[model samples]
Target chain A: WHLGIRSQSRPNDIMAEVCRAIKQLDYEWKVVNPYYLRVRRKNPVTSTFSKMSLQLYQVDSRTYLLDFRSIDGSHTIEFFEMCANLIKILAQ
Target chain B: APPIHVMLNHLYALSIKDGVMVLSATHRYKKKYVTTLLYKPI
Candidate 1:
């Protein structure tokens, strides 16, 4: 079974927290694929390489009863569609 | 680190040791339920 964490608040915090949850789930091994977005470099003039930024995508979950909370705050949803989609994509 | 980042940060920051992803996080809640799906055999 595939599981995904809820992305409610503080994307970073939630991502870290959910990863921890996955490890705790006691799976022998698992692969995590995080989506990233491109951004401008802070000091393009000085920097040698291009600078890109990363942002967490807030996806909706289709399944119900997957506990997804944020480290910065608390959000309770009856259904976790975001996580479900993630799982679905991963399953493929 | 910038003010905003994407899931790639976490993905890139991932450390692989002994051929495994080292994940360390704690949950402030408990497991609610488990799901089981049925599909036709291929």
Candidate 2:
């Protein structure tokens, strides 16, 4: 599953929101880089793929982008929609 | 330390935050949101 969001916030600001989103959902995640993160459902947690990768990129001085990639799982659509809801909330 | 460059590079990483920082970002973007489909969409 892949989805993206466009925001006026800087990467740092947006990234933190993502971090919060992940943490708030209680997902297990590790930072791959300043602009990349890999998140997975904390064992016992089901649906929404087992793992996924997220990245933040800047397109303009004011435009920032968030990218999502699913690494594994069956409920791809459902999982993506769940994340989409929270991410959109974060971005908004 | 391997060398001056290595030291500097390692030090630079310190400036970057490690781990997740749970924080509120409301109005940081000072606007609403629009989620998009990348490339292929069904």
Residues A29-54 of candidate 1: C-alpha lDDT, one tens digit per residue: 22233433332212224433222222
The top-ranked prediction according to TM-score is 2
RMSD to native, candidate 2? 15.3
TM-score of each: 0.23, 0.56
Ten contiguous residues minimizing lDDT sum, candidate 2 chain B: B7-16
List the candidate 2 regions with Cα displacement exceeding 4 Å: A1-3, A43-49, B1-42
Can you write out model 1's per-residue Cα lDDT over B1-42, one digit (the tens) per residue? 112212211211123335433222232334532222222111
| Residues A1-92 of candidate 2: C-alpha lDDT, one tens digit per residue | 21255677756777778888877777778987877888777434453245667767676766776666656323343345445545645845
TM-score of chain B of 1: 0.26
- Provide per-model DockQ scores: 0.03, 0.03
- Model 1's alpha-carbon lDDT is 0.29
TM-score values for chain B across all models: 0.26, 0.19
